[PDB]
C-alpha cells in the first residue's frame with residue numbers, strides 16, 4: 001500500500017505520491033501553457049516547411065547537370081570506370 | 084509494348100521494376116495511388132501485372148531448362 | 155476464501171470481461187475463416203506457374 | 207583611479223574584515239569589461255587588436271609608444287579571446303564555491319585564488335615567448351602555498367608534486383625558449399611564422415616544447431602528479447586547475463609550437479599520436495580501479511585532454527575546432543563534477559572513499575539529478591559541447607591517421623564505463639548506513655552547477671556560436687602545401 | 688560588404704608586416720570562396736537527387752561526379768605551407 | 777489488496793496438519809501442540825510439514841530457522857512475523 | 862589468496878591482513894548483516910582486491926565452471942557454423958534463370974557510360 005516517507009525531501013518530481021490539494025487549478029495553468037507553446041511553435045516553424053519534390057523545375061535541374069558537364073570538360077574528367 | 088526510355092523515366096519507375104511490362108506497372112501504380120493502397124481495390128490491374136510476371140518467369144524457367152539440357 | 159484444501163468455487167468474472175472475450179474470440183475465428191476461404195488457392199499453394 | 211580604488215579596498219577591509227565581497231565584485235567587473243571588449247572586437251581580421259606593452263625602457267611603469275620595443279607584449283586575437291572569456295566566466299564561480307567552508311585566514315585564501323585567476327587571464331594575453339613563460343610559471347608559487355595551507359590531509363605531498371612536476375617540464379620549455387631567443391633574437395608571436403629554421407634545429411627545439419606539453423597537459427606516462435594534486439587540493443584549487451590550467455597546455459601548442467616548428471611538427475606527429483592513444487586508453491582503464499571520488503574525476507580529465515591533443519595535431523580545420531570546443535566544454539563540465547565531489551559531498555561528510563557512498567537519491571534527489579546530468583555530459587552526450595569536441599577531434603584524428611583515430615573511437619565506450627560505474631553506485635541502492643542524512647544541494651551550489659550546465663548545453667546545441675572568433679584560427683596553423 | 692584587395696606571398700617583401708598579413712588573409716579568403724563553390728555544388732546535387740528519385744543516376748551523374756571531384760581539393764589548406772615554401776626552387 | 781490475520785494463519789495451518797496423513801490424530805492438534813511429541817511426527821515428517829507450510833504461505837525458510845520451530849505456536853508466530861506472507 | 866591476481870599482491874602488503882576473498886554475491890542472503898544489500902558487517906576486514914569481490918562486482922555464476930562454460934560456448938558456435946557450411950554443399954539448384962533487363966541491363970539508368978558498361982549495368 002503506502003508507507004511513511006520524510007516530508008523534508010523536496011524533489012522537482014514531487015517525491016512520494018505527490019497529489020497536491022490544488023492540483024486541478026495548477027492543471028488548468030499547465031494545460032494553458034501547453035497549448036500556448038505547442039501552437040506558438042507550430043505557427044513559428046511553418047515558414048521552414050516544404051515538400052520534397054516539386055520545389056525546383058526540370059529547367060534548373062537539367063541546366064545544372066549541363067553546367068556540371070561543362071565544368072568536368074574544362075578540367076580533364078573521365079567518368080567512373082571509364083578507363 | 085516495351086516502354087520508351089523517356090516514358091519510363093517520366094513515370095519514375097523503380098530501376099528493378101523496369102522490365103518488358105512496366106507498361107502495366109504504370110496504370111497499376113496510378114490506381115494504387117488513387118485508392119489508398121487498399122487491398123480490396125486495384126484488383127484488375129494487380130492481376131494484369133501478375134500475369135505479365137507469370138509469362139516472364141515462364142520464359143526464364145524455360146531458359147534455365149535449355150541451359151540445363153546443354154550440360 | 156472460505157474453503158481450504160477443498161474443491162474451489164466457480165470463479166466470478168465480470169459481465170464485461172466475458173463479453174469482451176466472446177467478441178475477441180468470435181472476431182479472430184471469423185476473420186481467420188474469411189481469410190482462408192478468400193485465399194485458399196494461393197495460401198495452400200496451387201496453380202503452379204511453371205509450364206506443363 | 208588606482209589610488210582611489212586602493213583607498214576603497216583599504217576602507218572595505220578595515221570595516222568589513224573579509225575581502226571576499228570586494229573580490230567577488232571585482233571579478234564580476236572584470237567579466238563585464240571583457241564582454242565590452244568582445245563587443246568592440248573586430249572579427250574580420252586575423253590581427254592582434256588590443257595591444258599594449260609593459261616595462262619598456264622609455265616608460266618602465268607605463269605603456270610604450272616608442273619606436274624600439276624591448277618590453278613585454280600583450281594583445282589578443284580570437285583564439286585568446288575564447289579562452290579569456292572562459293577564464294572570466296570561471297573565476298567568480300571559483301570564488302563563490304568556497305563562500306562558506308573557509309573559516310580561517312580566509313582573506314589570504316581568497317587572495318591566492320583571485321591572484322591565480324588573474325595570472326592565468328593575463329597569461330592568455332601574452333604575445334611573446336618570454337612573457338608567456340613568465341606568467342606560465344607565476345602560478346606555481348601560488349598553487350604551492352594554497353595547496354599546502356588549505357589542502358586536505360595529504361596536502362604537503364600534493365603541493366610538492368604540483369610545484370616539482372610543472373617546474374620539471376617548464377625548464378625544458380625554457381631551454382627551447384632560450385634557443386629560440388638566441389637564434390632569432392626575437393620572441394614575439396606576431397611574426398614568428400615568418401622565420402624558417404633549419405629542419406634539424408626545429409627538431410631539437412620541438413623536444414623541449416613538447417616535454418613541457420607532456421607534463422602540463424598531462425600525457426602518458428608523466429600524468430601521475432595530477433590525480434594527487436587534484437585529490438588533496440581545496441575546491442578552488444581543483445576547479446581552477448581542471449578548468450583553466452590544463453587548457454593553458456592546449457593554448458601553448460597552438461600558440462607557441464605550431465606556427466614556428468611546422469615541418470618538425472609534421473615529422474613528429476605520429477609520435478604525438480602514439481602518446482595520445484596511450485594516454486586515452488591506459489588512463490581510462492586505470493580509472494576503473496580507483497576508490498577515491500576526486501581521484502576518479504581527476505582521471506577523467508586526462509583522457510579528455512588526450513582526445514583534445516589528438517584533435518589539435520590533426521593538421522585539419524575540423525580537428526583544431528574540435529580541440530578548442532572540447533577544451534571549453536571540459537572547462538565547463540569538469541569544474542562542476544569537482545564541485546560535486548569536493549564541495550558538496552566532501553563538505554557534508556569530509557570523506558572521499560567510494561565505499562562509504564551509496565543510494566544518495568533517497569534523501570537528496572536534486573543532487574542525484576545533478577550527478578546524472580553532469581555524468582552524461584562528461585561522457586559526451588550530444589547537445590553537450592563535450593560531444594561536439596570529441597566528435598570533431600576524432601574526425602580530425604581519423605583523417606590524419608585512419609587506424610589510430612579509428613582505435614581512439616574506443617574512448618566513447620571507456621569514458622562511459624568509468625563514469626557510469628561511479629554514478630551507478632552513488633545514486634542508487636539503499637541509502638548508506640555509514641552516513642546520515644544531510645541537507646540537499648543549496649541555492650549557491652545549485653546556482654554554480656546551473657551556470658556550468660547551461661553553458662555546456664548552449665555550446666552543445668549550437669557549437670557554431672563560437673565560429674565568429676575562431677574561423678581565422680582554424681586555418682592559421684594547418685600545414686598543407 | 689568589404690572586398691579587401693588581394694595580395695600574394697610571391698611579390699611581397701616579408702619585412703612589411705601589413706602586406707604579409709594581407710597575403711595570409713587573402714589566401715584564407717580564397718580558400719573559403721572555394722568552399723562556397725563546393726557547397727553550392729552539393730546543394731544543387733541534393734535538389735537534383737530529391738527531385739529525380741529513381742533516375743537520379745542519369746539525371747545527376749554530372750553533379751555527383753563533380754562534387755566527388757571537388758571534395759579533395761576545395762577544403763581548407765592554410766597559408767603556412769605556401770608562405771614557408773617557394774615552389775619555384 | 778489482501779491482508780492476513782493471525783487467526784487466518786492458524787486456521788490454514790490447522791487445516792494443513794489435519795489433511796496430513798502420518799499424523800496420530802486430527803482432534804489432538806492444539807495451538808501449542810508439539811509435532812515431535814504430541815502428534816508424533818518423524819525427524820523427516822516435520823521437515824515435510826515445514827516444506828508444506830512454506831509452499832502454502834509462499835515463503836522460503838532458511839535451514840537454521842526451519843529446524844528451530846518445534847511447536848505450532850512457534851510456526852504461527854514465525855509466519856506472522858514475515859511481512860510478505 | 863585464492864586467485865592469481867590476489868596472490869600477485871602478497872609481496873606488496875606489509876602489515877596488512879592477508880584476507881581470503883569470498884564473493885559477496887555467494888554469501889548466503891539469509892544471514893543478517895549491518896548493510897543487508899552489501900552483505901557486509903561493520904569493521905569486517907577487506908581484501909586488497911575487494912572491489913572485485915563486493916556486490917557491485919560483475920556477477921559470477923556457479924552452475925558451470927568457467928572453463929566448462931567456455932567449452933560449451935565454443936562447441937555450440939563450432940557445430941552451428943560447421944553444420945551450416947557443410948550444408949551449403951548439399952544444395953538443390955534453382956529452376957528459373959535470373960531475370961534480365963533491356964538496354965544491356967539498363968546501364969544508362971544506373972548512371973554508367975559507353976566506355977564503362979561493366980561497372981554499371983544489369984544482366985541484359
Ligand SMILES: CCCCCCCCCCCCCCCCCC(=O)OC[C@H](COP(=O)(O)OCCN)OC(=O)CCCCCCCCCCCCCCCCC
Pocket residue numbers: 256257258260269321324325327328331340341344
Ligand atoms: C606576477 C606575474 C608576472 C607579472 C607580469 C605582468 C604584470 C602586469 C600587471 C597587470 C597590468 C596589466 C593590465 C593593465 C594594462 C592595460 C592597461 C590599458 O590601458 O590597456 C591598454 C590597451 C590600449 O589602450 P590605449 O592604447 O591607451 O587606447 C585607449 C583607447 N581609449 O587598452 C586595452 O586594450 C585594454 C586591455 C585590457 C587588458 C586586460 C588585462 C586582464 C587582467 C587585468 C588585471 C590583471 C592583473 C594581474 C595581477 C596578477 C599578476 C599577473
